[PDB]
Amino acid sequence: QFAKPEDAVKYRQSALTLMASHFGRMTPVVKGQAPYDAVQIKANVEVLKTLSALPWAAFGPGTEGGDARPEIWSDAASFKQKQQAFQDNIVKLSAAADAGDLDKLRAAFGDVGASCKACHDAYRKK
Amino acid sequence: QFAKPEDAVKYRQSALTLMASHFGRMTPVVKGQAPYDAVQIKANVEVLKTLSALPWAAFGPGTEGGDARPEIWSDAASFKQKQQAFQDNIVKLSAAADAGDLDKLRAAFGDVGASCKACHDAYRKK
Ligand code: HEC
Ligand code: HEC
């Protein structure tokens, strides 16, 4: 759906921004600094699940640009493992939210955050 | 979820970018320039439905900025009508896609596009 590489870059940066916000806005809830409303968190994690599927198709071949490292494209399988692993960490968060289980939510939130870094450390330029 | 107005602006611009892409990528399909695959379009319109709910909460009071016109906030009810009307135009598109009805899809796509403009004409700076 992208006329030029720049369009893919713009898309993925926007998708990732919207993930930062839907993930990060739960930090006060996980920390207990804001109340835990199970229904609200369930709905927010559903949004996050949808968003978290979106960036990867905007790293198609030849879409070098932005802050993406070239290693995304020199080993396709390894980048795919990282995004798939990340989306499965989101599945754990979804299951916790759907269960209304705050302990579960906290653990999964931590693991999701670690997975965001795991990717950044390999694939995002400074 | 926004520390500063600038964060709300960044969010809504990213959400609207992702809507432009999920809407606009169907133009070749509606025109018949690309094949119509009902299952694919159903799934894409589901993404668009999720995205199309997201910008409006990032126009909270005091979030002037970007290319938003101030009239968003001097008549809250009228801006709310426009976003709600738009989301109901998306409902028509969703119903068409879920039915697999290409004629329906074309008509709804046109009406959605008109609704994007209807808002821009009142509420988006040049
Ligand atoms: C690899 C499988 C990634 C995972 C998992 C996550 N992110 Fe990431 N992110 C990645 C890349 C390669 C890039 C650079 C994209 C580019 O072309 O510039 C990024 C970028 C971001 C950004 C900045 C977006 C922007 O406005 O330019 C943010 C805010 C960001 N990423 C956040 C983020 C979070 C919170 C994640 C887990 C919930 C996450 N990313 C996962 C690669 C990958
Ligand atoms: C009002 C109810 C709107 C509807 C419906 C749509 N858009 Fe719009 N859009 C609106 C505003 C007020 C703004 C400016 C936001 C700001 O603070 O700058 C916009 C902006 C856009 C953009 C640019 C985003 C960016 O990268 O800065 C795009 C690409 C865009 N809008 C697209 C778009 C489409 C395709 C719509 C219908 C499917 C649509 N918008 C509806 C207000 C409103």
UniProtKB/Swiss-Prot annotation, chains A, B:
Concerning InterPro entries, the annotation shows: Cyt_c/b562, Cyt_c_II, Cyt_c_prime, Cyt_c_prime_subgr
Q: Which UniProt keywords apply?
A: Electron transport, Heme, Iron, Metal-binding, Periplasm, Pyrrolidone carboxylic acid, Transport
PTM Pyrrolidone carboxylic acid: list the residues: 1
Heme keyword on record: yes
Give GO BP annotations, semicolon-separated. Answer: electron transport chain
Per the record, a Pfam family?
A: Cytochrom_C_2
What protein name does the entry list? Cytochrome c'
